[PDB]
Design a protein around this ligand. Structure first.
Ligand SMILES: Cc1ncc(COP(=O)(O)O)c(C=O)c1O
Ligand SMILES: Cc1ncc(COP(=O)(O)O)c(C=O)c1O
Ligand code: NA
Ligand code: NA
Ligand code: NA
Ligand code: NA
Lengths: 385, 384
């Protein structure tokens, strides 16, 4: 049902005349639409936005103003939110293994909601923020996750209540259970299964006199790649919500979406800076590559949808980035029209785990994130409606 | 002669004073690396490929030693400019340039370029009319870690045509360059490339196009977790001997990156968490694959890790501090029992490491501390 944010060819042209490539263009209205869709289809799970996916300040402010909470991974992330006026009470420090700077930032900002998955974490947490609310993260199954989040993270389920009891012994507040099924999950069942497991744990805790009040179901909601998205997100979210109503009518339930919130709200605009026409497969060199926004190729095993403009015949083509490294090859055997130096191409669904792993390799600048609603092209869309 | 390596004592005293993670660079080791190259490869003047490590004190050291610089972008030119390096000292050796880079080259009077395609000629001639150009040719190497000859390099049969077209656009056809690949374990690749270049210089002479300069690129290797079987002295002497034989009347240059600093930097990082439940213990470190260990991903690399202290070792896993499952750095690594707060040391970490670090998950970039500016250095000089 929902439309992904996509710039038109005309918009690409006018934007790139004004702004030097490469740049990202983010639609706040599409971030908002994504937040509201999750509120509509998954009403039971309050949102802690996993800003690790995309920390663009205007996005964070938008989300804060919509009532979102935030999942923070580091001191840096807390500091960003603090400078935007967000109180520590709206944060969960959900990195199960915290460092000294992070714990100090948490104390400074009155962040007192933590996750953990190991006994070695308890004394660090109890010392930095005594009496903090803690959710123990359990390791869960998922046969359809792009990124496994249950080997490096997550306690065995049979240690969960023992960990909560040890944290309680150290003066922390044993508040509940969390899990993350893994990133880019194409499984709804994984959420349903984790929910049943947590239900049994909550019941066993109650008997021990520990009363658990909060359940955090993590993120993993998927976004379309160069082959679309083979999941119906509304049905996924409704099925999760149904299982939460079924099992957890009286518990405060929460979610930590990262990828989903902005993935479909951001486009990359990049120019062809060189061609190589010799031989059978042409090459085009772009001004953005694998050490910038296309770093998700490497870290996130990802294939982004590339759009070329032009109505003539297409042939298999290679696209590379602007660095001096051989690894900087983005697409091979990609059906493309004949492009020339100065042509702009468009990459859609570029909002998540892209700019956050960009670098200044070879001294290139970080591509900036342009706010679409501040540009005359947005206004032109409003008037066209 | 030997790698820069902090002792355990030095690690402990540094880490009491500087929060982990941090890199420590030895300027004296960089200088020793530069001098070693001057000694064993005297015929090739150095354009330092600062893409490997652009730490400002290193660049300033190198500039003070008389090094030139290979720049890959506007940003790199800007860094050198702020350090008072003149554009005469730079080669803009990215074969495919962008608008900002060409504008910076113009502003700073950088007038030496490489290229490998006819589509690059007009860009260069517009930006810096009359610039000196070297045409980059594609060459073979079956012992390179990183292939620098598929994305880059013109076919040899196109080279002189490219120089002539450059001439037609008013650029100065100065000569030929090549890069055999990064982490080359072959000396032959260099000797064979020199031979190809020599045939082209012979042919260009017969056409009345007299070429004056040859740039042989980089690729000199650095040790990894398994060390290094290449004798660097012998590789450099072999190359130099071929330069003397085939290019006695040509100005020859080299563009080392990795070699210059790779052996001059160490990383210090703390254990921030343990996981003992397994048959195999895990240790979580405060630096990972989204920081200086990014070379695991982009550079196919394995770094030498040193753990300290005592007792029986068992196979252990080390992960980084991110929330990502991919942030696993070593598996089945024989390590002693470590605890939260213990420091570990990674050596030979100076090249293509901090340069591909990120602020993923909001972590700060690990800073580069200059060893020579630290009491630990003075203390080594007091000993001696
Ligand atoms: C604790 C936590 N919350 C939220 C997220 C966001 O995940 P996704 O982008 O798959 O929704 C992650 C992903 O790494 C995570 O580790
Ligand atoms: C143009 C150029 N010069 C020099 C180098 C340095 O290579 P190395 O670090 O292997 O010496 C590179 C590596 O990408 C390069 O592209
Ligand atoms: Na159990
Ligand atoms: Na039950
Ligand atoms: Na990267
Ligand atoms: Na990286």
């Amino acid at each position: 049902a929902m439309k992904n944010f996509r710039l038109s060819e005309k918009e690409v042209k006018t934007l790139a005349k004004r702004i030097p490539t490469p740049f990202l263009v983010a639609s706040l209205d599409k971030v908002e639409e994504n937040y509201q869709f999750m509120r509509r289809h998954l009403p039971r799970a309050g949102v802690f936005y996993a800003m690790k996916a995309n920390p663009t300040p205007e996005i964070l402010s938008l989300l804060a103003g919509l009532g979102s909470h935030f999942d923070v991974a580091s001191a840096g992330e807390m500091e960003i939110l603090h400078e935007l006026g967000v109180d520590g009470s709206q944060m969960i420090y959900a990195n199960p293994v915290k460092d000294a700077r992070g714990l100090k930032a948490a104390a400074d900002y009155n962040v007192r909601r933590f996750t953990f998955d190991d006994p070695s974490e308890i004394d660090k947490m109890a010392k930095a923020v005594p009496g903090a609310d803690v959710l123990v993260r359990i390791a869960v199954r998922n046969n359809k996750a792009l990124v496994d989040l249950n080997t490096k993270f997550g306690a065995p389920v049979e240690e969960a209540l023992d960990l909560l009891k040890a944290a309680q012994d150290a003066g922390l507040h044993a508040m509940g259970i969390c899990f993350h099924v893994g990133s880019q999950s194409l499984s709804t069942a994984a959420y349903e299964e984790a929910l049943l497991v947590a239900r049994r744990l909550f019941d066993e805790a109650e008997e021990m006199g520990m009363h658990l009040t909060d359940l955090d179901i993590g993120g993993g909601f998927p976004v379309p790649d160069c082959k679309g998205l083979n999941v119906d997100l509304a049905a996924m979210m409704e099925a999760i919500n149904k299982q939460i109503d079924r099992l957890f009518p009286d518990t405060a339930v929460w979610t930590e979406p990262g990828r989903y919130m902005c993935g479909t709200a951001v486009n990359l605009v990049t120019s062809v800076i060189g061609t190589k026409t010799r031989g059978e497969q042409p090459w085009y060199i772009l001004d953005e590559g694998i050490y910038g926004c296309f770093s998700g190729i490497m870290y996130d095993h990802w294939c982004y949808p590339l759009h070329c403009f032009g109505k003539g015949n297409k042939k298999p083509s290679t696209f590379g980035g602007p660095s001096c490294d051989g690894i900087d090859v983005l697409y091979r055997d990609f059906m493309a029209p004949e492009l020339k130096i100065g042509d702009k191409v468009l990459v859609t669904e570029m909002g998540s785990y892209t700019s956050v792993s960009a670098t200044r390799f070879n001294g290139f600048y970080l591509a900036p994130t342009i706010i679409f609603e501040d540009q005359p092209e947005y206004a032109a869309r409003l008037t066209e409606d």
